[PDB]
Paper text:
We therefore prepared A272C and A272W mutants—the first to provide a side chain of moderate size, also mimicking PbActII, and the second to block the movement of the loop completely, both presumably favoring conformation 1a/b. The A272C mutant caused a moderate 5.1-fold activation upon Mg2+ binding, whereas the A272W mutant showed a large 18.9-fold activation and the largest observed rate (9.78 ± 0.06 × 10−4 s−1) in Mg conditions. As with K270M, the increased Pi release rate in the A272W mutant is not due to faster elongation, and there are more long filaments of this mutant at equilibrium. The A272W structure in MgK conditions resembles overall the mixed structure (root-mean-square deviation (RMSD)(Cα) = 0.269) more than the Mg-ADP structure (RMSD(Cα) = 0.410) and is positioned close to the Ca-ATP structure in the PCA analysis. The A loop is forced into conformation 1b by the Trp272 side chain. Glu73 is in a double conformation, one similar to the Mg-ADP structure and another to that of the Mg-ATP/ADP structure. In addition to limiting the conformational space of the A loop, Trp272 forces Lys270 away from the Asp180 side chain and toward the solvent, widening the gap between His74 and Lys270 from 7.7 to 10.4 Å and only slightly altering the conformation of residues Leu268-Asn281 (RMSD = 0.27 Å, Mg-ATP/ADP-PfActI compared with Mg-ATP/ADP-PfActI-A272W). The occupancy of ATP in the active site of this relatively fresh crystal is only 0.3. In the PfActI H74Q and A272W mutants, the conformations in this area resemble those of the Ca-ATP (in H74Q) and Mg-ADP (in A272W) states.
Residue numbers in the entry:
A (entry chain A): 6 to 40, 52 to 366
B (entry chain G): 2 to 125
Amino acid sequence: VQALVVDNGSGNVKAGVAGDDAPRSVFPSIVGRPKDAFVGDEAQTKRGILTLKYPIEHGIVTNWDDMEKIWHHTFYNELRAAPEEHPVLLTEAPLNPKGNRERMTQIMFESFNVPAMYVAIQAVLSLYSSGRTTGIVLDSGDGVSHTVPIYEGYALPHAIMRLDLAGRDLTEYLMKILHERGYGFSTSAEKEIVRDIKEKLCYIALNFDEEMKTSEQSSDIEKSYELPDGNIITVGNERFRCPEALFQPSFLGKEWAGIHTTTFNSIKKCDVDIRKDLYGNIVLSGGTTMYEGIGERLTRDITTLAPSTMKIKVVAPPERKYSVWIGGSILSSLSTFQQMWITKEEYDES
Amino acid sequence: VVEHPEFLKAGKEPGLQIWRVEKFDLVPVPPNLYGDFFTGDAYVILKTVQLRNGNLQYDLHYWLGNECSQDESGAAAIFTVQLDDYLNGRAVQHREVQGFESSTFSGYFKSGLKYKKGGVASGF
Ligand SMILES: Nc1ncnc2c1ncn2[C@@H]1O[C@H](COP(=O)(O)OP(=O)(O)OP(=O)(O)O)[C@@H](O)[C@H]1O
Ligand SMILES: [Ca+2]
Ligand SMILES: [Ca+2]
Ligand SMILES: [Cl-]
Ligand SMILES: [K+]
Ligand SMILES: [Mg+2]
Ligand code: NA
């Protein structure tokens, strides 16, 4: 029997079958209820008649009724799979509380009657998808970013760092700074358009100050985007000022450390004898790591922070957007997966 | 996580054991082929050494061919972790990339490391 693989993303669920190289279902982690529940894309097409909610806003499930609606949508509407007839691999955020993991397990075994399940840490799956057992994963998604050191297959919990700054904050920041040129994107639907602008036009400057200087010297920076209503918008230095907030959260009015500093701090929490292996295997994961220029910029900035004896290598796998899901698909395909899971009978008699 | 037949054979005697990842499984490499690696494939290597005190020492290497598929390199990594666990965590793990292998790993093969075109089909 073929396992189902479900990556519970703050912004989008990725779901599919073990042994595929990509998720066949990707949909927004949104539940709409009347102003009797709609999920994902259908909730957005009905935002007029629904109140919309994010049940996993910052990688942690906080609304369990709505999360169960998302899982029901996953199994029945997206995959058309009987959850009671497949093993399920479910992902969780780094540092997910054990009580949260237990609640998701209870729902799977007692509401969906899944016959067997396994819970995997997202960043560990991404590291495996990159062909590594040791490294530090920088996973930047929609609602959360984590830096996760991993040694010989297992995360080091005392060194994991969480940054509540990720893709949704960048979309919101682009919405804000486009007011400089007179745009007033503000509604939920407009936010989706600006998200697409961000993905299509933004990039990370190798050196922010020099890019500000060069971009002001000509109009070469300007790039166009065709809005749904046919109008064209032109974006200039917003293209790299927006993702610059990953490195300078002060742009968002936050005293938080940027992603380079956070990665450095995470490695420093690990004992000196394994840091070389972490610095040499900095693996990017997640949609918000897809910006052009990110690997080159992170390499410079981490090299500056780290002792000069270290060898910094930032790895940016081409299919890193879905590397959590891919790692899950690999793990749940292995001849050994059947020994890793918990069965419903074991759970029910525990 | 033990019932896998190749786990049951791993690290029982001093020597050299090589498996190839094939369709999400660990498959023994014919010993006549030891030292020759398909560039299209990923492998797991366990070197077992008899210590002076009689205990056994373990080094696990996972070797990644330049053209191996993502399922193959990911499975090699995962099987390495699982084999180490089965050996009670006492194995030291080594990532080996084609053309950049450690001198320890190349030293396992009297004839040195060689590569061949091709490999077993991806599971993906
Ligand atoms: N090419 C891109 N450039 C920049 N950002 C992108 C790109 N593609 C996707 N994103 C952003 O990635 C985010 C979603 O990626 P992901 O789906 O990996 O986050 P999540 O996993 O959904 O949420 P988390 O992992 O934080 O709980 C969205 O904010 C999306 O805009
Ligand atoms: Ca192959
Ligand atoms: Ca070990
Ligand atoms: Cl330095
Ligand atoms: K994330
Ligand atoms: Mg994610
Ligand atoms: Na290094």
